[PDB]
Amino acid sequence: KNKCVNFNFNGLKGTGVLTESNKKFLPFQQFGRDIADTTDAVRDPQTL
């Protein structure tokens, strides 16, 4: 985390710096998207 670390979360691949988030997903929510319709928030499959 906190580095340029490629990530493959449940088959969703991307590149970026992972940081702790303050957003509150709904219980079923998995992926988060921004105004740009691009992945900006993710949920770790192992730890909620």
């Binding site: 105004i35 740009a36 319709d37 691009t38």
Partner: protein, 48 residues
């Protein structure tokens, strides 16, 4: 001279009130912003 001064002051007050009252009077400027920003949005949408 006095009549002209009074007319000028009244006219400038009326212009102040008219600007404070009509919202669309500044459209010639507003649309500029309302163009440029939205254009960017469309560009970003192309990423999806």
């Amino acid at each position: 001279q006095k009549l002209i001064a009074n007319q000028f002051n009244s006219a400038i007050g009326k212009i102040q009130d008219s600007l404070s009252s009509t919202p669309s009077a500044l459209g010639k400027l507003q649309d500029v912003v309302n163009h440029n920003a939205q254009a960017l949005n469309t560009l970003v949408k192309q990423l999806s």
